[PDB]
RNA sequence: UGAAAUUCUUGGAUUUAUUGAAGACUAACUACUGCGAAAGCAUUUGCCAAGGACGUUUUCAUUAAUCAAGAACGAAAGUUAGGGGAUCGAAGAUGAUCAGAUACCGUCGUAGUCUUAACCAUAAACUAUGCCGACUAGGGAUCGGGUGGUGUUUUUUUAAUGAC
């Protein structure tokens, strides 16, 4: 239960701090300065990486934190944190106001995948092991509505938003059976999917690279697979 | 009559919250969140009072609070050999010996304590100490005369001092 | 021994690579007690996710102290066996399966210079639940007694045993399983045994030692939901 | 009253103390081994002498000098001697002890209460 | 918020088993023995082996999510000694030191109302 | 096990939990207690007959004590012919043969351990102590029965029993 910050260039451990309970969930914002810690006690700890101090300490969740999603942009004040516990409870913490802005419960199993995208209004993609995906729309005000619920047929280990070549919104869901698939938010149909390996395996996570152009599929057997979805998305073939 | 010397070490050194219940005739130990600091104090206090409950002198029982590698070994005569009537009654006399001398002989050599609660025997010490004691007492049960056991007790005593 | 110097064994030849964490496929399951018990929450269990999970849940028996279920340390020495029968949305509906006492409690009651009366009866409820009860009694000495012991003549133990037999059989026959469990918690049966057996001999530490479920009737989920409300 | 409860309380102790003092006896009564009893008798005399007149002595000799009870004409002593049976040392000691004891008889603003016995301790 | 397990400990003469399970007991959460944490057979029953195994199980126990347990110590029982040995005690201590909250302690050694004959024979055993 | 190997174990040992089946055996209560001529006898309930002691202002009237000959029972082990065979286990094989407090340990285990119908008749089968009768000191503990009290508890309506 000791968080240790290590500086690659300097190659030494810059900061060491103690957390309340063991934490198996770690999220870093795209701007690469904040880190969110999800403990099994339901407490959320936000730390400034460069400085190494606790910025926020949100304690609202009852179950163990299963997913953490940072939303933000450079030169903006709409910075937000989305946390999902193992009880199917999702909360949208607001960093600037330091308060819980929204609370969602429709998920029943643990929430493993969270993703916020800006609607040119903000959309939240929540996915859990209950084999469903929920699309929510919300703002800084007391507005938070459910738009669609997609039965994705697969245990959602990780999920997020993806953009097509023409700009069409796409959702990527990597899950059990070691399958990565793409679903249109509107149609709800699976455009493309990966071949299921004969050996039973799970995708424990997905790592977006190159502005989501290629993703590393981390498998339970400690093997990493690189898929370039953008070229595969252009390909008419429905197999990734 | 010994309670005056029992609660002080627990309440002060161990920082435990002690009580004895007349109605159920039991001792009560509770960890105080605002005062207690050692996680293992509560079980240590429970370990100590049990030793007294088995028949042990208090001061010997204090050793369990002071140290951490002191354990209780326990067994019956019937586990060794099915002795009955006089055979059982004599066998107890063999372990104690005249005036309890034999029980003191083992205890000093092995650095343990022995209570002969009828056919029930309990041993306190380090794991190495109690195991060898188990051998000596059992050897008496099987019918070995104590004088021969006394010689072996002396032998193991020297090995203890050298190491 | 895991050591290198430990001589090699045959079983080390054929070994499967540890590649799947079972807990990943394990799915937690919540356990609830019948409405008779004050605290319905009695914890949770886990099973492999359905490929079904339900079959392993059926026949699942869990033993728990009454003190937690009733929130009173008066029942610290009593344990209750609950068997899973129906499952709904991670909730495991359980039914009474048995009752027994802690070993330390029993060994405490057994003492020297007194007589122990053990009576057992195999009887069935009105709900076609065949069960076997074990009741333990201990002779006592009067307030103004002066003899060290309080042994009872064998005719008394036979008389005491008989009186215990009718009451145990009477209560079970004229009640359902749920009503019987409602009697166990306040131990009104023990008080009834004491009063009936009072005249024959003074007794102490009268208890229903154990309860067994020998045969079950045909399962009735309708009879189950009513029990859980 | 309540003093009856007390009266019962002493009587229980007396019986239980008697029962213990009883309990030690038949176990001791059943152990008849001459080595054990001899050791017990030996130390008893030592305690007797340290812890706890001629007229009694003369009477004691007076009985001894007429009866003639402590020589080898007695039934037991004559039986051992005549049969080559006292040559073993242990029985000789008993015979000799008898003679000495017989010989002994023949001798002449600012700027502007028990803690924890029954309750939780 | 508090999830309970059952830490079944079996302390034999030659080894100690430390086992943690769900309340039903059918699911195994973690099982570690005296032989796990030791090199030599003679030291399988050592309290030191028990402490290491207890520490091992405790780490896994926290990893899975179980924060409290109910300890059910037992010995070989049957036709042999009924009291748990020093090893189970050391394991019980180690669990307390591990930080896992101990719910309830009970001795569940198999006590036979009647039993078959013992291995020693008439002249005894355990020289 | 003092220390190890034969040995079982990835067709999952050991361990966990819900059961079922086989054959013994009645732990803890169990005691300086009880019953039986002795050897012996400890779960619940029923049947069969048997027995000591106590109470009796009931009955027969010497019918009694001891006992060669003669007869019944007789610990464990053992023999014959069936059944059963869980555990243990003489015999036997085999792992190991290093170290003296742990120096005889482990695995397999035949006969045997259990039962039915028959044989033998030996023990420190001891209280190293014939049986029957009378008499010869105080004390209080226990078992069974009986008698007595204006004693306690209980019968939680009394009571009477039962327990003290
Ligand atoms: Mg009796
Ligand atoms: Mg008799
Ligand atoms: Mg045969
Ligand atoms: Mg005899
Ligand atoms: Mg006479």
UniProtKB/Swiss-Prot annotation, chain A:
GO BP: endonucleolytic cleavage in 5'-ETS of tricistronic rRNA transcript (SSU-rRNA, 5.8S rRNA, LSU-rRNA); endonucleolytic cleavage in ITS1 to separate SSU-rRNA from 5.8S rRNA and LSU-rRNA from tricistronic rRNA transcript (SSU-rRNA, 5.8S rRNA, LSU-rRNA); endonucleolytic cleavage to generate mature 5'-end of SSU-rRNA from (SSU-rRNA, 5.8S rRNA, LSU-rRNA); maturation of SSU-rRNA; maturation of SSU-rRNA from tricistronic rRNA transcript (SSU-rRNA, 5.8S rRNA, LSU-rRNA)
WD repeat boundaries on the chain: 20-57, 60-105, 109-146, 151-193
One GO term describing the cellular component: nucleolus
UniProt-annotated location(s): Nucleus, Nucleolus
GO molecular function: U3 snoRNA binding
Predominant location category: nucleus
Disulphide bridges, residue numbers: none
Domain of life (superkingdom): Eukaryota
Alphabetical UniProt keywords: Nucleus, Repeat, Ribonucleoprotein, Ribosome biogenesis, rRNA processing, WD repeat
Subunit structure: Interacts with snoRNA U3. Interacts with MPP10. Component of the ribosomal small subunit (SSU) processome composed of at least 40 protein subunits and snoRNA U3.
Misc: Present with 8070 molecules/cell in log phase SD medium.
Known function: Involved in nucleolar processing of pre-18S ribosomal RNA.
UniProt protein name: U3 small nucleolar RNA-associated protein 13
Stretch of the intact protein here: 83 to 327 of 817
From Swiss-Prot, chain B:
Locations listed in the record: Cytoplasm; Nucleus, Nucleolus
Any one GO molecular-function label of the UniProt entry: unfolded protein binding
Cellular component aspect of the GO annotation: 90S preribosome; cytoplasm; nucleolus; nucleus
Keyword Ligase: no
UniProtKB keywords: Cytoplasm, Nucleus, Phosphoprotein, Ribosome biogenesis, RNA-binding
Keyword hit for Membrane: no
Domain of life: Eukaryota
Domain KH residues, every copy: 85-137
Effect after changing residue 125 to D: Accumulation of aberrant 22S and 23S rRNA intermediates
Function: Required for small ribosomal subunit (SSU) synthesis. Has a role in the processing of early nucleolar and late cytoplasmic pre-RNA species. Recruits DIM1 to nucleolar pre-RNAs. Indirectly required for cleavage at the A2 site of the 20S pre-rRNA, forming 18S rRNA, and at A1 and A2 sites of other pre-rRNAs.
Subunit details: Component of the small ribosomal subunit, ribosomal RNA processing complex (SSU RRP complex). Interacts with NOB1.
Protein family per UniProt: Belongs to the PNO1 family.
Name of the protein this chain belongs to: Pre-rRNA-processing protein PNO1
Organism: Saccharomyces cerevisiae (strain ATCC 204508 / S288c) (Baker's yeast)
Full-protein residues shown: 111 to 273 of 274
UniProtKB/Swiss-Prot annotation, chain C:
InterPro entries on file: Ribosomal_eS1, Ribosomal_eS1_CS, Ribosomal_eS1_euk
Localisation per UniProt entry: Cytoplasm
Changes after translation: N-terminally acetylated by acetyltransferase NatA.
Assembly mode: Component of the small ribosomal subunit (SSU). Mature yeast ribosomes consist of a small (40S) and a large (60S) subunit. The 40S small subunit contains 1 molecule of ribosomal RNA (18S rRNA) and 33 different proteins (encoded by 57 genes). The large 60S subunit contains 3 rRNA molecules (25S, 5.8S and 5S rRNA) and 46 different proteins (encoded by 81 genes). eS1 interacts directly with uS11 and eS26, which form part of the mRNA exit tunnel.
Biased composition (Basic residues): 1-17
PROSITE patterns (UniProt xref): RIBOSOMAL_S3AE (PS01191)
The name this protein goes by in its record: Small ribosomal subunit protein eS1A
Keyword hit for Repeat: no
An example molecular function term from Gene Ontology annotations: structural constituent of ribosome
Cellular compartments per GO CC: 90S preribosome; cytosol; cytosolic small ribosomal subunit
Ranges where the record places region Disordered: 1-19
Function description: Component of the ribosome, a large ribonucleoprotein complex responsible for the synthesis of proteins in the cell. The small ribosomal subunit (SSU) binds messenger RNAs (mRNAs) and translates the encoded message by selecting cognate aminoacyl-transfer RNA (tRNA) molecules. The large subunit (LSU) contains the ribosomal catalytic site termed the peptidyl transferase center (PTC), which catalyzes the formation of peptide bonds, thereby polymerizing the amino acids delivered by tRNAs into a polypeptide chain.
N-acetylalanine: modified positions: 1
Keyword Phosphoprotein annotated: yes
From Swiss-Prot, chain D:
Name of the protein described by the UniProt record: U3 small nucleolar RNA-associated protein 14
Annotated organism of origin: Saccharomyces cerevisiae (strain ATCC 204508 / S288c) (Baker's yeast)
Subcellular location: Nucleus, Nucleolus
Other comments on record: Present with 1470 molecules/cell in log phase SD medium.
Cysteines engaged in disulfide bonds, as pairs: none
Family listed: Belongs to the UTP14 family.
Coiled-coil residue spans: none
Function: Involved in nucleolar processing of pre-18S ribosomal RNA.
Top-level taxon: Eukaryota
Primary gene name: UTP14
Subunit structure: Interacts with snoRNA U3. Interacts with MPP10. Component of the ribosomal small subunit (SSU) processome composed of at least 40 protein subunits and snoRNA U3.
């Amino acid at each position: 239960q000791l968080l240790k910050i290590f500086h690659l260039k300097t190659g030494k451990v810059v900061r060491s701090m103690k957390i309340s309970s063991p934490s198996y969930i770690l999220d870093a914002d795209s701007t690469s300065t904040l880190l969110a810690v999800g403990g099994t006690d339901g407490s959320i700890i936000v730390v400034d990486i460069e400085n190494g101090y606790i910025t926020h300490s949100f304690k609202g969740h009852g179950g163990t934190i299963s997913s953490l999603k940072f939303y933000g942009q450079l030169n903006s004040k709409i910075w937000l944190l989305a946390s999902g516990d193992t009880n199917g409870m999702v909360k949208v913490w607001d960093l600037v106001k330091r308060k819980c802005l929204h609370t969602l419960q429709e998920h029943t199993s643990a929430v493993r995948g969270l993703d916020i995208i800006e609607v040119p209004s903000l959309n939240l993609l929540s996915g859990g092991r209950d084999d469903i995906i929920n699309l929510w729309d919300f703002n800084m005000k007391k507005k938070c509505k459910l738009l669609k619920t997609l039965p994705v047929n697969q245990q959602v280990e990780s999920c997020g938003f993806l953009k097509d070549g023409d700009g069409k919104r796409i959702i990527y869901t990597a899950g059990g059976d070691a399958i990565f698939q793409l679903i249109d938010s509107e149609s709800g149909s699976v455009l493309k999917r990966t071949n299921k390996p004969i050996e039973e395996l799970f995708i424990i996570g997905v790592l977006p690279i190159l502005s989501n152009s290629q993703m590393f599929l981390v498998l339970s057997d400690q093997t990493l697979q690189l898929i370039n979805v953008e070229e595969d998305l252009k390909n008419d073939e429905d197999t990734i | 009559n010994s309670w005056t010397k029992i609660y002080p070490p627990l309440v002060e050194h161990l920082k435990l919250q002690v009580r004895m219940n007349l109605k159920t005739k039991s001792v009560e130990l509770r960890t105080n969140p605002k005062f207690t600091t050692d996680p293992g104090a509560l079980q240590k206090g429970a370990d100590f009072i049990k030793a007294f409950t088995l028949g042990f002198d208090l001061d010997d029982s204090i050793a369990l609070l002071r140290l951490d590698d002191l354990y209780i070994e326990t067994f019956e005569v019937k586990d060794v050999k099915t002795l009955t009537g006089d055979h059982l009654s004599r066998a107890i006399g063999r372990i104690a010996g005249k005036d309890g001398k034999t029980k003191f002989a083992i205890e000093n050599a092995t650095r343990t304590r022995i209570v002969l609660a009828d056919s029930k025997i309990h041993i306190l010490g380090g794991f190495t100490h109690i195991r060898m004691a188990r051998e000596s007492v059992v050897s008496l049960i099987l019918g070995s005369p104590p004088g021969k056991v006394y010689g072996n007790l002396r032998t193991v005593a020297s090995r203890l001092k050298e190491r | 021994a895991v050591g290198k110097n430990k001589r090699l064994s045959k079983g080390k030849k054929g070994q499967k690579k540890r590649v799947v964490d079972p807990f990943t496929r394990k799915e937690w399951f919540d356990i609830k007690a019948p409405s008779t018990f004050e605290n319905r929450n009695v914890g949770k269990t886990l099973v492999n996710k359905s490929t079904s999970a339900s079959d392993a849940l059926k026949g699942r028996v869990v033993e728990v102290c009454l003190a937690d279920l009733q929130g009173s340390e008066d029942h610290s020495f009593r344990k209750i066996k609950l068997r899973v029968d129906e499952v709904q949305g991670k909730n495991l509906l359980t039914n009474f399966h048995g009752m027994d006492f802690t070993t330390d409690k029993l060994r405490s009651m057994v003492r020297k210079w007194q007589t122990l009366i053990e009576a057992n009866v195999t009887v069935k409820t009105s709900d076609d639940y065949v069960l076997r009860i074990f009741a333990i009694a201990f002779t006592r000495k009067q307030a103004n007694q002066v003899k060290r012991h309080s042994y009872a003549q064998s005719s008394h133990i036979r008389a005491i045993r008989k009186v215990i037999s009718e009451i145990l059989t009477k209560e079970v026959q004229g009640s359902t399983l749920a009503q019987l469990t409602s009697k166990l918690i306040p131990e009104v049966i023990n008080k009834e045994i004491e009063n009936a057996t009072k005249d024959i001999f003074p007794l102490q530490n009268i208890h229903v030692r154990k309860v067994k479920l020998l045969k079950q009737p045909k399962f009735d989920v309708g009879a189950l939901m009513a029990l859980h409300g | 009253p309540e003093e009856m409860r007390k009266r019962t309380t002493e009587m229980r102790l007396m019986r239980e103390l008697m029962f213990r003092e009883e309990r030690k006896a038949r176990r001791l009564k059943k152990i008849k081994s001459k080595t054990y009893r001899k050791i017990k008798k030996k130390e008893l005399m030592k305690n007797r002498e340290l812890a706890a007149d001629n007229e009694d002595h003369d009477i004691a000799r007076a009985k001894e000098r007429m009866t003639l009870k402590h020589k080898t004409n007695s039934k037991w002593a004559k039986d051992m001697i005549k049969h080559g049976m006292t040559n073993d040392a242990e029985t000789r000691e008993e015979m000799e002890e008898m003679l000495r004891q017989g010989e002994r008889l023949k001798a002449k603003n600012p700027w502007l209460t028990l803690p924890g016995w029954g309750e939780w301790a | 918020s508090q999830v309970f397990g059952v830490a079944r400990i079996y302390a034999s003469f030659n080894d100690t088993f430390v086992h943690v399970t769900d309340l039903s007991g059918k699911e195994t959460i973690a099982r570690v023995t005296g032989g796990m944490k030791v090199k030599a057979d003679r030291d399988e029953s050592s309290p030191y082996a028990a402490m290491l195994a207890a520490q091992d199980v405790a780490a896994k126990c926290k990893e899975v999510g179980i924060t409290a347990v109910h300890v059910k110590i037992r010995a070989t029982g049957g036709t042999r000694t009924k009291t748990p040995g020093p090893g189970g005690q050391a394991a019980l201590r180690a669990l307390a030191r591990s930080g896992l909250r101990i719910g309830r302690i009970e001795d569940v050694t198999p006590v036979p109302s009647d039993s078959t004959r013992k291995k020693g024979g008439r002249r005894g055993r355990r020289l």
